[PDB]
């Protein structure tokens, strides 16, 4: 809405500037504006969208955890609960915004495996963030929505992408985190991380130096989690 009067190219340019200035709220607003122009996003533009919202929700999640921890230790007036609720509502708002962009209409216009997997991974992640704070009647549905998005992404990535593809690797990492932290399925988490790592290792020989760097970075993050989990 507010970005309706600005050129798409200007919104992208300003998103990049906002990133350099570490103004992630601005960056997210610019990229929301760019998405709402209705055109598909390039690879670089998808990354800008992801970076922007990851930083915004990242800060909110960190704040929520601080407040939640204080709240649990307190169990004094209603202020901690009230403020935790405030941050929670704001977080849910951002997640809903991202999910809204994915549903209107990024996913349905995403035909290439790379774009579709990227957006479905995002969908899984933002349902996962909703799941982290969920308690009510729709908690199980939120979890299943995350699961469903991740699963579709996994199915496509396995068919259409090499096992070293960074998006495929990052998807597997985050889906494994979903299993461990949300779905109470640590064995599934470990299995997924292990198989992902091993299948990537076997395909490294096909890669250039630059691609090798990117793939091995994410492989190390998988290994880091396996080390923590075992």
């Amino acid at each position: 809405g507010a970005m309706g009067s600005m050129e798409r190219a200007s919104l992208i340019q300003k998103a990049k500037l906002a990133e350099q200035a570490e103004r992630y709220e601005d960056m997210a607003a610019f990229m929301k504006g760019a998405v709402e122009k209705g055109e598909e996003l390039s690879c670089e533009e998808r990354n800008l969208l992801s970076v922007a919202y990851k930083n915004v929700v990242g800060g909110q999640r960190a704040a929520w955890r601080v407040l939640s921890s204080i709240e649990q230790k307190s169990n004094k007036g209603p202020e901690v609960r009230e403020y935790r609720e405030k941050v929670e509502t704001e977080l849910q708002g951002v997640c809903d915004t991202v999910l809204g962009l994915l549903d209107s209409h990024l996913i349905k216009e995403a035909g290439d495996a790379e774009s579709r997997v990227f957006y479905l991974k995002m969908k899984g992640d933002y349902y996962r963030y909703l799941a982290e704070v969920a308690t009510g009647d729709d908690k199980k549905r939120i979890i299943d929505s995350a699961r469903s998005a991740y699963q579709e992404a996994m199915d496509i990535s396995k068919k259409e992408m090499p096992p070293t593809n960074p998006i495929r690797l990052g998807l597997a990492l985050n889906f494994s985190v979903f299993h461990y932290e949300i779905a109470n399925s640590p064995e599934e988490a470990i299995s997924l991380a292990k198989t992902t790592f091993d299948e990537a290792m076997a395909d490294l020989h096909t890669l250039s130096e630059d691609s090798y760097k990117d793939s091995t970075l994410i492989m190390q993050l998988l290994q880091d989690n396996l080390t923590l989990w075992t």
Binding site: N47, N55, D125, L173, V177, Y180, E181, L221, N225, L228
Partner: peptide, 8 residues
């Protein structure tokens, strides 16, 4: 918690 994917 466990680390998920960071920014690139």
């Amino acid at each position: 918690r466990t680390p998920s994917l960071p920014t690139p």
